[PDB]
Symmetry: D2
Subunit: 386 residues, 4 copies
C-alpha cells in the first residue's frame, strides 16, 4: 500500500524535518535535530538520500577541526544507512552579513565573501558525491526601487555564476548548477523571480550547459503561475536538473506544506508530466512540518510526502493507460498538436489555398474541443472513481 | 505644463480609444469609432502615431477590394496628420475559430490558417512603415491540464515563429518581432506567461536576433511581479523592442487603466529606468477608457496617459540630478554594485585572505544600507516635496 | 455510480448552460439556447430545478404581451418536466444604463429605475414559486477613488434593500433575500466584496431577518480567502440562505469552472461542512462551460458538476464515519474545542490558579496537535486510498 | 516643511522601531532597544505616544517584583517626555504554548490561560491610561481543514470576548476593544480574516457597543481588497476605533513597510477619507524598518511614516478645496449619490411612471460619468502638478 523504497529516489533537506518551527511571529516549538538522527530516521521511512546547506551540517564559525569531525560523523551515518547525498547548497541568507544579498550585495567585499563561502562547500559537496549544486538567491533583491540597479545586479549575478563555472571546470568536477527561483520573501522582490526568468538568465552565462533550474512547486504558485506548465518549459529547454516538491495554498507567504497538500490537481498533473517525460533526478521534498506538530508529526508529515507522490503516480498511470482516455485524447486532437504545422515548408504553406483562400472558417469554429469530457475522466481517475 | 509633442513618441492602439466598452457582463456603452477619426483626434492631442490589429483596420471577411479602400482612407489620414504607424499586430483571438489558439491550436488546419492570416498582415505592416510586429498569444493556453501537452505546444509555437522569421528574411523586410506575455485571461493559463518565459523561449528560436519582448505593465502585475525589474532584465538581454504602458491595481482581471493609475510608484521607477537606459522606442499605451465614460472621457483618459508620463519623467530627472540623492546613492553603495566583484580573477580571489579567512563578518554585517533614507528622498521627489 | 436525482436538489442558472461564450476578447462560440430546451435537457440529467435573471427569460424591452407568452411557455416546460424554480434574481448589470451601478448609481433616476425593475421581477419570482431572491451588485463599485463616496453608497444600498423588504412584507410574500458578494470584476472594486462584508451590512438593515448571503466558491477565492471558513461563519450567523457552487484556480478573473475543478481539497471540505451542518437549500451551480466546447461539452460539463458533488459527498461521509478518523479527531482535541472555555464563569476563572499561577506552560507547549496525521487520513479518504 | 507635533496624534508600537530584524530566513540584524530609549527617541521625532504588547514591556516569565520595576521605569520615561499610551494589546502568538491559538486553541487549558494573560494586561493598560485594547488573533486559524471546526472556534471566540466584556464592565473600566483582522500569516488561514468578517462577528457579541475594529492597511491588501473602501464601511457602522497605518506591495507576505510606501494612491484616498470623516483616534504606525537598516535607518523610517501622512493630508485638503474639483464632483453626480433614492416612499415610487414606464433608458445610458477627468485632477493634486 504505497510504500516507498530507495529506488523511488525520494530525498529530503536536513532543514526540512529539522525545521524547529521559528516563524516571524513565534519561537521554536521543537528542539534541534542532530543531522545523524535525521539521516537514520529518513532511511527507516524509505528515503533515498538527504541534501544540506553548508551551515546545516557545519555550524557557522566552526574551526577546521570541528568541521572535520562534523563531516566524519555525517559520513558514518551515510555508510551505516545506505543514504546518498545527491545535492548540496550554500546558506547565503541567514547570517546578517547577507542582509542585502550574497552575489548581488551592494558591498563588494560581501560579494567576494559569498563566493569564497560557496566554493568551499562545492569541494565538500563533490567529496560527498553530490551531482547537483543548488543556488537559491533568497536575499538577492530589494524592498525599494532605488536600492538596487537591476542591470548592475544581473551583471554581478552573471559574474558570480561564471566564476563558479570556471572553478568547477578548472578542478575537473562532475557537478552541475541549478538555480532555484522564488518571486518574493524574504526580500520584497527577489531577482530571477520565476522559472522563466532563470531560464533566460542561464542563456547569457559563459557556459550555459553547466546550469539548469531547480523549480519549487510553492514558489511558482506564489506568483499565481501554473507549475506543470513551467516544468514543461524547463523540460523542453533541457534544463530540469532537480526539483523541489511541496504544497502551497495560493498567493501568500511560502507555506512549504507537505507534497500533495495545497493544489492537489496541480500535483496530479505534475506527477503525470514528470513520469511521462522520464525525469530521472531526485524527487526532493523542500517542506516544513507545521509548527503545531511534535516529532511524531514531523515523521508522519515526511512519510505523507512520499505516500502522496506514489498515490498520484498510480492514478496518473491509470489515466494514461485507460483506453477511454486514449480515445478522448484523440477526440480533443492531442495527436494533431504533436504533428508539425508545416513540414511541407513556407512556400508550400503560402501556395496552399486550403490554408486560407478556401479555408472554411465557420466549420472549423463549430468543432467542439471535447476538453470537459477529457477533464472529467481525469477527475474520475484522480478520485478513484475509475 | 506637461504638453506632449510628436517627438515624445507617444503612440496608441486603434483598439484603445476605440474600445466600445463591452465586458464579460455588459453591452457596449459607446459607438464604434472610425479609425480615420481616431487618427485625427490623437494627432490633435499630441500623439506621435497609432498601432493596429489587422481586424481593427479591415473588417474580418472583407473582399480584396474593400480591403484596398480601407487602407487608402487610413493612409490618407496618416498623410493629412503626420501620424506614423510604428507597430502592427494580428488578431488571433476574437474569431471563434481561434477558441483553442492560433499558433498552438490542437487542430492543424487552424494553425496553418493562423500563420497565413499573420503573414498577410506583415506585408501590410511593412507597407505602412511599421518597424515592430507584435504577437500576443492570448488564446494559446488551456483551462485544464489534459487539453494541452505544453512541450508539443512549445514545439508548435517555435515552428510558427521560425516560419515567420524565414518569411521576413526571404522577403528582405526590415521588421522585428516582439512577443507580448500575459499570464492568464482569456485562457485559464496562457503559454509564455511572463517576460522571463518569453525571453527564455526566444533563445531557442532559429534566428533569435529577430525577436524581442513587448512587456505590458498590467500583465506582469497580474502575476504580482515587479514590472521595472522585469524591464531591467529585458534591457540587460538587449530585447526590449517595444513596451505597452497602462495601469493595474494588483492581481485581478486585466484592467488596462490609463498609465499612471494603478501602482504609481512602480510607474515612477519604470519611467526612471526607461529614461536612464535611453530606451528610444515608442511609448505605447495599451489602455481602455472605462466604460463609464462618454467620448469626452475617452479623450481625457488618453491625454492623461501622456500627461502622467511627462510628469513622472520630470520627477525622475529631478531625483537623479539632486546632489543629495547622488550622495545617498553612494551612502547605499550603488557605486560599488556597479564595480566587478572579482576583476582580479578566480585564482586571485581564492588567494585573497581578506575575502574569507580574515574577513570581518561582524563589522560588515553592522553596516546599515541607508535604503530608507534614499527611498524617502525618492518619495519626496515624486510628490514634489523637493 | 454517482447518478443524481431531483432529491439531491441540484439546480442551475439559465445563464450557465446558456452562456454563449462571449468573453472580453472574443465573440460567441455557441448559439443561444431556448430556455425551454435548457429546462428539458437539465431535467434529463437529473437536475431538480433552474434559476433565472429577469432578462434571461424575458428579453429586455419586451411588451407586456410578449412577456406573458414567454412566461407561459416556460411554465409549460416546468409542468412537463417537474422542474422547480427555487431562486430568481434581477439583471442590474448588462444594459448600459447600469454602467455605474443600479442601487448605488450616482444618478438618482437610475437608482429608482433599478428598484422598479427589481420589484417587477420579485412578483414574477413569487408567482413561479421561488423561495430566495438573490442580489448580485456586480456594477456597484468603482475604478477610481473619487468616483464613489462609499459611505453615501452604503446609505443608498441600505435604502434600496430596506425598500425591497418593505415591499415584500406589505405584499405578504414568503420570499427571503440573499446578497451575493464578489470582490471585483466587472468593476475595479465591488462594494460588499466578501461574505464578511455582506454579513456585516445585513445587520444594519431595518429587517435583518429577511436577508442572508449567497456566497460563491470562486468569488471568495478571488480574494485568496478560505471558502469553507467563510461558509462556516455564514452558518454560524444563521445566514446561509443559498450557495453558488463552481471552481476557480486562484486569484485571477472569475473563471466559473465546473464544480470540483479548481481547488479540489477546498471542494471536499466544503461538501463535508454542508452535509455535516445539514444545509438543506439548493445546491446551485453558477458555472460557465468553457467556450472551447460545443453543446455536447456543455451537457458533459453540467453533468460533471453533479457527479463531483456526489463523489465528494461519499468521500466526506466515509471520512467522518471511519473509526480511525474519529480516534484522530480526539487525538487533535477537536472534542475539547467544542467544550466551553469557562462555563464556570468569570469569577471562577479569575480564582482558578491552574489557569495561570500554576499553569505549566512548557508542558502544554510540548503537546503535539497531531494535525498532519489527521490531514493525511483526509487525503487518503479523498483519493480513495481508504 | 511637514514637521509632526504631538497634536497630530502619531503613535508607534514598541515592537515597530524595536523590531530586531529576525525573519523566517535570517537572524536579527539589530540589537534590542530598551523601551525607555524608544520612548525618548520617538518623543524627539514628534510622536504623540506609544503602544505595547504585555511582553514587549515585561519580559515573559517575570516575577511580580521585576514586573513592577519594568513598569516604574516605563512610567518615568512617559512622565519625562509627555508621551501617552493610547492603546495596548496582548501577545498571544509568540510563546510555543499558543502554537494552535489562544482564544480558539483546541486545548481548553490553553484557552483559559490565554484569557487570564489578557485580563492581567487589561488592568495594566487601564492604569497607564489606554483607551483602546486591541486583539490580533494571529494564531487563531489552521493550515488544514480538519484541524479546526470553525463554528466551534467562533463559539469559543465569542465566549472569550464576551468574558472580556463582562470583566471590563464589572470593574467599571473605560476601555473599548478593537479586533484587528488579518487573512493569513502565520497561520495558513486566520479566523475573521478581513474588516468585514470582524464587523459581522461583533454583532453577535453580548455587548456589541464595546467592540470595534483596528484595520491595518497591509492586511486588507493581502487579500487584494480596497483598504479605503473597507475603512468607509467601518466608519459607516460606527466601529473604527483605531487604525494601523503602513504599506504593502500587493498580495504576498505581510511587509509592514513604512506608511506611504506600497500603494501610494490608496494612501492618498485613505488620508482623504480619515480627514474628511473627522476620525479623531490615534494615527498608529504598525511598521517594521527593513532589516537592511541600522539604527539611523530605523529613525529615518519612523520619521518618514509621519512625513508622508502630513504630505498626503496637505494634498488631499488641496484637492477637496479646489473649485475645479468641486465642479467635477458635481459633473460626476457625487451630489446626487448623497441624496435619497426614494424619500417619497415605496408607494410613490411604485406610482411614479417616470421611474419605469416612461423612463428613457437610452438617454440615461448615454450620459458619461466624467470619472476619468475627476481622477486626473486627483492625480495632479497628489503629484503637486496643481
Ligand atoms: O537553497 C536551498 C533551499 O534554501 C532555503 O532553505 C529555501 O527556503 C529553499 O527554498 C531552498 O530550496
Ligand atoms: O496584441 C496586441 C494587443 O492585443 C490585444 O488587444 C491585447 O489585449 C493587448 O494586450 C495586446 O497588446
Ligand atoms: O446574480 C446572479 C448571478 O448573476 C450574474 O450572472 C453573476 O455573474 C453571478 O455570479 C450571479 O450569481
Ligand atoms: O496585536 C497588535 C500587533 O500584534 C502583532 O505584532 C501583529 O503582527 C500586528 O499586526 C498587530 O497589530
Ligand atoms: Mg518554499
Ligand atoms: Mg522554498
Ligand atoms: Mg526550495
Ligand atoms: Mg492588458
Ligand atoms: Mg493587455
Ligand atoms: Mg498589450
Ligand atoms: Mg463567478
Ligand atoms: Mg460569479
Ligand atoms: Mg454567482
Ligand atoms: Mg502587518
Ligand atoms: Mg500587521
Ligand atoms: Mg497591526
Amino acid at each position: 500500500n504505497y510504500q516507498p523504497t530507495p529506488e523511488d529516489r525520494f530525498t529530503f533537506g536536513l532543514w526540512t524535518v529539522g525545521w524547529q518551527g521559528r516563524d516571524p511571529f513565534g519561537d521554536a516549538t521543537r528542539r534541534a535535530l542532530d543531522p545523524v538522527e535525521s539521516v537514520r530516521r529518513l532511511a527507516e521511512l524509505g528515503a533515498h538520500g538527504v541534501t544540506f546547506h553548508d551551515d546545516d551540517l557545519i555550524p557557522f564559525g566552526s574551526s577546521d577541526s570541528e568541521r572535520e569531525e562534523h563531516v566524519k560523523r555525517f559520513r558514518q551515518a551515510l555508510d551505516d544507512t545506505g543514504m546518498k547525498v545527491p545535492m548540496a547548497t550554500t546558506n547565503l541568507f541567514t547570517h546578517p552579513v547577507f542582509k542585502d544579498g550574497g552575489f548581488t550585495a551592494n558591498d563588494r567585499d560581501v560579494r567576494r565573501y559569498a563566493l569564497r563561502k560557496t566554493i568551499r562547500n562545492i569541494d565538500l559537496a563533490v567529496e560527498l558525491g553530490a551531482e547537483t549544486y543548488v543556488a537559491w538567491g533568497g536575499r538577492e533583491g530589494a524592498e525599494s526601487g532605488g536600492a538596487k540597479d537591476v542591470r548592475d545586479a544581473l551583471d554581478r549575478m552573471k559574474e558570480a555564476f561564471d566564476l563558479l563555472g570556471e572553478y568547477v571546470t578548472s578542478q575537473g568536477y562532475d557537478i552541475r548548477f541549478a538555480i532555484e527561483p522564488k518571486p518574493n520573501e524574504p526580500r520584497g522582490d527577489i531577482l530571477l523571480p520565476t522559472v522563466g526568468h532563470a531560464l533566460a538568465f542561464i542563456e547569457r552565462l559563459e557556459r550555459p550547459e553547466l546550469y539548469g533550474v531547480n523549480p519549487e512547486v510553492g514558489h511558482e504558485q506564489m506568483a499565481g503561475l501554473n507549475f506543470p506548465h513551467g516544468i514543461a518549459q524547463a523540460l523542453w529547454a533541457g534544463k530540469l536538473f532537480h526539483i523541489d516538491l511541496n504544497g502551497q495554498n495560493g498567493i501568500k507567504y511560502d507555506q512549504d506544506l507537505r507534497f500533495g497538500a495545497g493544489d492537489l490537481r496541480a500535483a496530479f498533473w505534475l506527477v503525470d508530466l514528470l513520469e511521462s517525460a522520464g525525469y530521472s533526478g531526485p524527487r526532493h521534498f523542500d517542506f516544513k512540518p507545521p509548527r503545531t506538530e511534535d516529532f511524531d508529526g514531523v515523521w508522519a508529515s515526511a512519510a505523507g510526502c512520499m505516500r502522496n507522490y506514489l498515490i498520484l503516480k498510480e492514478r496518473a498511470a491509470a489515466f494514461r493507460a485507460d483506453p477511454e482516455v486514449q480515445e478522448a485524447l484523440r477526440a480533443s486532437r492531442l495527436d494533431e498538436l504533436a504533428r508539425p504545422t508545416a513540414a511541407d515548408g513556407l512556400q508550400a504553406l503560402l501556395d496552399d489555398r486550403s490554408a486560407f483562400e478556401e479555408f472554411d472558417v465557420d466549420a472549423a469554429a463549430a468543432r467542439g474541443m471535447a476538453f470537459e469530457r477529457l477533464d472529467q475522466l481525469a477527475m474520475d481517475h484522480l478520485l478513484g472513481a475509475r
